[PDB]
Amino acid sequence: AIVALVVAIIIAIVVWSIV
């Protein structure tokens, strides 16, 4: 895993904001 999922997932959102 959940942890690794949050990272890849969370980061996925960031890439959007930027973008």
Curated annotation (Swiss-Prot):
Mod. after translation: Phosphorylated by host CK2. This phosphorylation is necessary for interaction with human BTRC and degradation of CD4.
Transmembrane segments: 1-19
Record localization: Host membrane
Superkingdom per UniProt: Viruses
Domain note: The N-terminus and transmembrane domains are required for self-oligomerization and proper virion budding, whereas the cytoplasmic domain is required for CD4 degradation. The cytoplasmic domain is composed of 2 amphipathic alpha helix that form a U-shape.
Subunit architecture: Homopentamer. Interacts with host CD4 and BRTC; these interactions induce proteasomal degradation of CD4. Interacts with host BST2; this interaction leads to the degradation of host BST2. Interacts with host FBXW11. Interacts with host AP1M1; this interaction plays a role in the mistrafficking and subsequent degradation of host BST2. Interacts with host RANBP2; this interaction allows Vpu to down-regulate host BLM sumoylation.
Function: Enhances virion budding by targeting host CD4 and Tetherin/BST2 to proteasome degradation. Degradation of CD4 prevents any unwanted premature interactions between viral Env and its host receptor CD4 in the endoplasmic reticulum. Degradation of antiretroviral protein Tetherin/BST2 is important for virion budding, as BST2 tethers new viral particles to the host cell membrane. Mechanistically, Vpu bridges either CD4 or BST2 to BTRC, a substrate recognition subunit of the Skp1/Cullin/F-box protein E3 ubiquitin ligase, induces their ubiquitination and subsequent proteasomal degradation.
Something else known: HIV-1 lineages are divided in three main groups, M (for Major), O (for Outlier), and N (for New, or Non-M, Non-O). The vast majority of strains found worldwide belong to the group M. Group O seems to be endemic to and largely confined to Cameroon and neighboring countries in West Central Africa, where these viruses represent a small minority of HIV-1 strains. The group N is represented by a limited number of isolates from Cameroonian persons. The group M is further subdivided in 9 clades or subtypes (A to D, F to H, J and K).
Family per record: Belongs to the HIV-1 VPU protein family.
Protein name listed in UniProt: Protein Vpu
Source lineage: Viruses, Riboviria, Pararnavirae, Artverviricota, Revtraviricetes
Portion of the parent chain present: 7 to 25 of 81
